[PDB]
C-alpha cells in the first residue's frame with residue numbers, strides 16, 4: 001500500500017515516499033538534527049521529462065567549448081565541444097577513445113560554468129526549484145534556509161544549482177575508482193537524480209553492477225529495489241557523519257605515508273579531493289578507527305540530502321545527470337561559521 005516513509009541502512013536512513021507531502025518536515029527534522037543524510041524518492045514523476053534528456057542538451061548547447069575529465073586517471077581533455085560529451089552518453093560507439101582504443105569514462109567539468117545555470121537554462125531552473133522536496137529548507141527564500149539571512153562571519157553558498165554529468169564506470173578495475181572523490185561541503189545540499197542512461201552496443205553490463213553494489217556494502221532492503229520493483233540505479237554513494245571527518249583524515253594520512261607520499265603531519269586529505277575509499281579502505285576505517293558510514297544507491301528520481309560537513313564520495317553505475325542545490329539549515333549552521 002502507499003505509505004509516508006520506510007527505512008534503509010538497517011534503520012539508519014530515512015526514505016520519504018511523497019516528495020510534495022506537506023507533512024514531510026515532521027519526520028525529516030528529527031533525523032536531520034542527528035546529522036543523518038535523508039533520501040526522498042519519486043522526484044522524477046514531478047518534473048518535465050523532455051527537459052532532462054541528453055539529446056536535448058546536445059541539440060540546444062552542443063557548440064559550447066568545454067573541458068572534460070577522464071575518470072580513470074583524472075587527466076583533463078581541454079577545449080572540446082559540449083556535443084563530444086552528450087552524443088556518447090548512452091551510445092558507446094560514439095565515445096572519445098583513449099590511445100588503447102577503449103571508450104573513455106568521462107565527466108563534463110564546470111558546466112554550466114559557475115553561477116550561469118539560471119541565465120543559460122531558465123525553463124530547467126523553474127522546473128527544478130518548484131519541485132524540490134522540503135521546500136522550507138531547500139528554496140532560495142524558504143522560511144528555514146538561512147543562506148540569504150547571515151552576515152559575513154558565515155561562509156554563504158554560491159547561487160545554484162550545479163550539475164553533475166558523467167558516464168558510468170564499467171570494468172572490474174573501475175570498481176575502485178571514484179566518479180567524484182571523497183570531499184565535504186560547508187553548506188547543506190540536496191542532489192536530485194534527473195536521468196539515468198543505460199547504454200547500448202556494449203550493453204548487457206548488468207552483472208558487474210550487482211557485484212559493485214554487493215562489495216559496496218549495500219543493505220539487503222536496498223538490494224530488493226533492483227530485483228523487485230525494477231527501478232533504474234544511477235550511482236553508489238558513501239556518506240560519513242561530520243563528527244567522523246578528523247578520524248578519516250588520520251586514516252588517509254597513515255595510508256599516504258604507507259604508499260610513500262611525503263606530506264606534512266597537518267595536511268588535509270579530504271580537502272585535497274584525491275582519495276576514493278574502496279572496499280579495503282572502508283573495512284580499515286571501521287576496524288582501525290571505529291567509523292561506520294551510509295552506503296546509498298541513488299535511483300532515478302531519488303533526492304539525497306547531504307549534511308554540512310559530512311564527507312562523501314560518488315561512484316556512477318550507469319551514465320547520470322544529477323542537479324544539486326545548496327542551502328543553510330539552522331540545524332547545521334555551526335559548520336559554516338568563520339570563528340572558534
Ligand SMILES: Cn1nc(CO)cc1-c1ccccc1
Pocket residue numbers: 002003004017018021042
Ligand atoms: C500520496 N502518497 N504517494 C506516495 C507514493 O507511494 C505515498 C503517499 C503518502 C502520503 C501520506 C501518507 C501516506 C502516503
Ligand SMILES: [Cl-]
Pocket residue numbers: 035242331332
Ligand atoms: Cl552537525
Ligand SMILES: [Cl-]
Pocket residue numbers: 120121122123124125
Ligand atoms: Cl531551459
Ligand SMILES: [Cl-]
Pocket residue numbers: 025133134135136137
Ligand atoms: Cl519543508
Ligand SMILES: [Cl-]
Pocket residue numbers: 179180181273
Ligand atoms: Cl573528484
Ligand SMILES: [Mn+2]
Pocket residue numbers: 183184185312
Ligand atoms: Mn559534494
